[PDB]
Amino acid sequence: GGVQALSAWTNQSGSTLYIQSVDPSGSLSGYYINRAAGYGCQNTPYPVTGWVYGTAITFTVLWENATESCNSITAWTGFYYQGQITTLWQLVINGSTSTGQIISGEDIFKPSQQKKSK
Amino acid sequence: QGGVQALSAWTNQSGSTLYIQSVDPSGSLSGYYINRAAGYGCQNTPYPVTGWVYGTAITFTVLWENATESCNSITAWTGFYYQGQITTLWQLVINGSTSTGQIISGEDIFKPSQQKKSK
Amino acid sequence: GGVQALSAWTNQSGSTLYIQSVDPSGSLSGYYINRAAGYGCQNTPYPVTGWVYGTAITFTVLWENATESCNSITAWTGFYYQGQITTLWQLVINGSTSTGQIISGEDIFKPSQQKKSK
Amino acid sequence: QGGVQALSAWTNQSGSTLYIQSVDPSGSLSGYYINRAAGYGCQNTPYPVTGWVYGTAITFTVLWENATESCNSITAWTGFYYQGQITTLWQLVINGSTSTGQIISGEDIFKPSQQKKSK
Amino acid sequence: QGGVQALSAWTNQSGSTLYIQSVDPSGSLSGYYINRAAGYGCQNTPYPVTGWVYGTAITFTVLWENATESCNSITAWTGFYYQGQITTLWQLVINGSTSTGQIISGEDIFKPSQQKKSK
Amino acid sequence: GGVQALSAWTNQSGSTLYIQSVDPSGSLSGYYINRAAGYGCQNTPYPVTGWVYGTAITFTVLWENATESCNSITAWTGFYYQGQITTLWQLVINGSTSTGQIISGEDIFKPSQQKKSK
Ligand SMILES: O=C(O)CCCC[C@@H]1SC[C@@H]2NC(=O)N[C@@H]21
């Protein structure tokens, strides 16, 4: 447990980051399920791009999937430290007109370990 | 326009959903499957899809390995868009198999889901 | 000899799968030469996408290259076992209207080993 | 057309420039940052950008590691195109950090640069 | 339209063929080469092409390594589409070379092949 | 020091190749800064694609970035030998009409090593 290729992280509001691939250049690829009260784009998967560099991570999701659109983007900035990813996020809405319309917060993502099945 | 687009979602009768994110010019298909089918591994979490669109023809395959749950298998669907529906035959192979007889068969019919473009 | 990145497999009807790349996520990339009596899209290369997971493999080719089109897609499902990939395939034709128009069969791909030259 | 295009370059007030090479259909953004900001590591060499465009919304993040100079950090900008300008808030995390308080904040306003299509 | 397209095939006078699968918006070229040139390694099997289109300008390079046969070399062509033809100069480098004098030169002229869109 | 993923090479005319990624198939990805007297498309980054195979390398840049266009492509062919990449390059201009309009030359790229900072 650093920040692995094929890891799953769940924040305090129930949402989950599926990192499926971190290539050698540090480039990240995954998808996000939002379960956060009061927000759109819940319960379906959206694509994640970002970067990893040691314990440092950025990732950003576009809120336009096949089932639902919220005309917005989020970008987390954060770090892996003692079994958690602690992040600060910023959310722009399309058509915004000042940095005052940008919404801010903090998510602490705790891991979930890989079950085997069938 | 109608048919198999980028940014289209399709739910089968077992309640599972194919999220098509992207179709290249190439034909290349990329997306997520969420499995919600009674009796199976790997439900309620999303898994990567690769495949191919060609008018109404479509293949797409899912690797059952994400970071919350793995099922040591791959499914490949093969099908066509016909009447506001995608009609597929699927085959499912389990890691370690030694006989084609161990490859499992089914049929899924995917109907378009409700795009709710609002916050 | 598992199912390798950079391997070449030739079925009973003479056709050949060139797997050039299997990334760590298991995602497969290659190209197919069809030599199967009675079929279109013979003797030129078509692109392959698929997945590998242990000895389990899917791959699918679109039958539209630069020289020739057959308005169809094939998808194999199969497994590596004692120096062979044994597969069942299904072929849709664009504009199909029932699952009865879908053609089925079995290919056993045997390997070929890498010659050095110049 | 105007707005956030493929093949558009944007210089902030510290004199740094975002080179946008490609926006997919997807929304996906790919490009280069050259940092020219007084006081920082990793100036005058280009670094990879990933991110996202959505009308006037835009995120983009830079990994400060190319082969001439590395700074053991990532920056993520978040912003919008408004009046022939992209207005961003950035956050910067250093490898090894243990407190959100160590994440650093700023604001960049990027104005379009001069495209000189000639040899 | 005519010129260097996606989904275009081009055979040179030695009988070899460039299969262009995809040109991005970017300019990026992706495809297969089959070498059919008397006297060489690596014939009759397909090899990956990367490169670049820019109106009538075009580079494209082939790595001579697929799973049936490898030749420990790379070829890079450089050329232009002019009169229903692509006219190229190629350079070929062998792994292990120590002198530019060991880089080999030729000229290929590729004429469009016959697209037979039927089953 | 072979030809690495994450290496930087600077030729005799001051230009620099940033190789950020060489995948296992040998496929190369990077970007070029031109500092060569008498040429367009100086001082900004252009995208590189190519191939590596032992000490053999090809790479090609399209001269169309966000800030400046020169309606041209270059392709180097060359090899790594005793801490240098020695190359021969060929430059086509869009709309060229004979192989006589194609410009030729030789670049010897010497390495630069990775500084740490902040
Ligand atoms: O409502 C929207 O515009 C799209 C969904 C936003 C969800 C936000 S992103 C930051 C925070 N973290 C979550 O897990 N959900 C919310």
Ligand SMILES: O=C(O)CCCC[C@@H]1SC[C@@H]2NC(=O)N[C@@H]21
């Ligand atoms: O190996 C497993 O059990 C997990 C994947 C199985 C889900 C199958 S795939 C075909 C069928 N159609 C669905 O919607 N789900 C099941």
Ligand SMILES: O=C(O)CCCC[C@@H]1SC[C@@H]2NC(=O)N[C@@H]21
């Ligand atoms: O005729 C077509 O529609 C396109 C070519 C189909 C070739 C099929 S795919 C399954 C089988 N395996 C081969 O090697 N060739 C045939």
Ligand SMILES: O=C(O)CCCC[C@@H]1SC[C@@H]2NC(=O)N[C@@H]21
């Ligand atoms: O870690 C470092 O010092 C190197 C990168 C810092 C450059 C920063 S990122 C945000 C700010 N805006 C710029 O244009 N450059 C600085």
Ligand SMILES: O=C(O)CCCC[C@@H]1SC[C@@H]2NC(=O)N[C@@H]21
């Ligand atoms: O190293 C080898 O011998 C295999 C590749 C050589 C094929 C060359 S590349 C340039 C020339 N043009 C062709 O059509 N084929 C040859």
Ligand SMILES: O=C(O)CCCC[C@@H]1SC[C@@H]2NC(=O)N[C@@H]21
């Ligand atoms: O002027 C142009 O058409 C675009 C820039 C060309 C620069 C050439 S490419 C070969 C040579 N090597 C360099 O470093 N610069 C020149």
